Amino acid sequence: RICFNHQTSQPQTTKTCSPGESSCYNKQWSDFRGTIIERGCGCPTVKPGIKLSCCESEVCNN
Amino acid sequence: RICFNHQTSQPQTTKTCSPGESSCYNKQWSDFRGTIIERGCGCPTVKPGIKLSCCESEVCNN
């Protein structure tokens, strides 16, 4: 699986996930800097208030 | 949890999920009409080839 791992609006970059991993995630929250977006492989746990989405296809997490 | 449950580009509608449900899903595939998007509560299992994304916040699956 290949997932985007770039932050917010920075240039698209990807991460080749570990074998067996089928998900990508997109984590979003807002603070003084505005809306922050973190992307990567897997589907991690997050604090309440953080918007998490996980998807199961190639580079599905932009 | 409240999730969108409208199809493709129809007007947005929502569904109040069952008490224990915390996920919303966005499922996409292609047919003669073009790209089709199904939305609802939960995080269903999909056949290979079908693009699936599940998220855990209010109306997160547009």
Curated annotation (Swiss-Prot), chains A, B:
> What tissues has this protein been observed in?
Expressed by the venom gland.
Q: Where is this region: Stretch between loop I and loop II?
A: 18-23
Location of the region described as Loop II in the Swiss-Prot/TrEMBL record: 24-41
Q: What is its main location?
A: secreted
Annotated segments matching region Loop III: 43-54
Q: What is the effect of changing residue 51 to N?
A: 2-fold decrease in potency of inhibition of Torpedo marmorata acetylcholine receptor (identical to erabutoxin c)
Effect in UniProt of substituting residue 12 to A: 1.2-fold decrease in potency of inhibition of Torpedo marmorata acetylcholine receptor
Outcome after substituting residue 4 to A = 1.2-fold decrease in potency of inhibition of Torpedo marmorata acetylcholine receptor
Point out the annotated site residues (description: Very important residue for binding to acetylcholine receptor).
7, 29, 31, 36, 38, 47
Site annotated as Moderately important residue for binding to acetylcholine receptor: where? 6, 9, 25, 32, 34
- Specify the effect of residue 14 to A: 2.7-fold decrease in potency of inhibition of Torpedo marmorata acetylcholine receptor
Q: Where in the cell is it found?
A: Secreted
Q: Where is this site: Key residue for binding to acetylcholine receptor?
A: 8, 10, 27, 33
Q: Which family does it belong to?
A: Belongs to the three-finger toxin family. Short-chain subfamily. Type I alpha-neurotoxin sub-subfamily.
**What is the protein name for this chain?**
Erabutoxin a
Species of provenance: Laticauda semifasciata (Black-banded sea krait)
